[PDB]
């Protein structure tokens, strides 16, 4: 309301490529957390349900970030069987 307009969340179109520009803007809003904030703000999330979701989202990150660290650690052993026949 007070801030200057056409500076925040504004993206310029390159060579009339609106699709690529919209995808870029949507990705900026996603990677900052705006899209997920807007959807959660439509209805009131009561404080107890918000804490239960944060705890769920936090435990999933940990598990998902530890599984991925193991996948990249074992990807080296996807090579062909070197002792084929034993």
């Amino acid at each position: 309301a007070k801030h200057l307009k056409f500076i925040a969340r504004t993206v310029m179109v390159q060579e009339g490529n609106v699709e690529s520009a919209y995808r870029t803007l949507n990705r900026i809003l996603t990677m900052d957390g705006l899209i997920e904030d807007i959807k959660h703000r439509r209805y009131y999330e009561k404080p107890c349900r918000r804490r239960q979701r944060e705890s769920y989202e936090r435990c999933r990150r940990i598990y998902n970030m530890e599984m991925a660290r193991k996948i990249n650690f074992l990807m080296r052993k996807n090579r062909a069987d070197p002792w084929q026949g034993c």
């Binding site: 056409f6 969340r9 504004t10 310029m12 179109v13 009339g16 609106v18 809003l29 209805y43 009131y44």
Partner: protein, 137 residues
């Protein structure tokens, strides 16, 4: 020069022109993408209404306004009325995550308007009014 996604600052001097008009002078297409309707108002850079079209004014009723095709039809209608008043290049400012968020801009492009930027003004309260209670579905 490398393309800058960042818009030209109004105060500083820029070489980017569209039909001899600076970024601060291009008319603005305000798109309100709600869950049930899409409203498009094209205004001049000096805040003078030029064209208005919504899914409701295009003959869609009830749940049929909240569709991509309905928003696209509103875009084409707004573009037609805006192009009569001399609008070619438009700065799109869309607020809301409704079904017609992207379709409305396609309609505007299909109608002969050129989009030079895409801004998001979706209102996000930083803490604000308590929203309605969750639906039991």
């Amino acid at each position: 020069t490398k393309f800058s996604i960042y818009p030209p600052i109004p105060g500083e001097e820029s070489s980017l022109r569209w039909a001899g008009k600076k970024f601060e002078e291009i008319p603005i297409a305000h798109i309100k993408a709600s869950h049930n309707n899409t409203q498009i108002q094209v205004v001049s850079a000096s805040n003078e209404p030029l064209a208005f079209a919504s899914c409701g004014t295009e003959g869609f009723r009830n749940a049929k306004k909240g569709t991509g095709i309905a928003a696209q039809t509103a875009g084409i209608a707004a573009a037609a009325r805006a192009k009569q008043k001399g609008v070619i290049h438009i700065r799109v400012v869309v607020k809301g995550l409704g079904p017609g968020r992207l379709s409305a801009m396609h309609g505007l492009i299909m109608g002969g308007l050129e989009v030079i930027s895409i801004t998001d003004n979706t209102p996000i309260p930083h803490x604000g009014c308590r929203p309605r209670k969750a639906r039991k579905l």
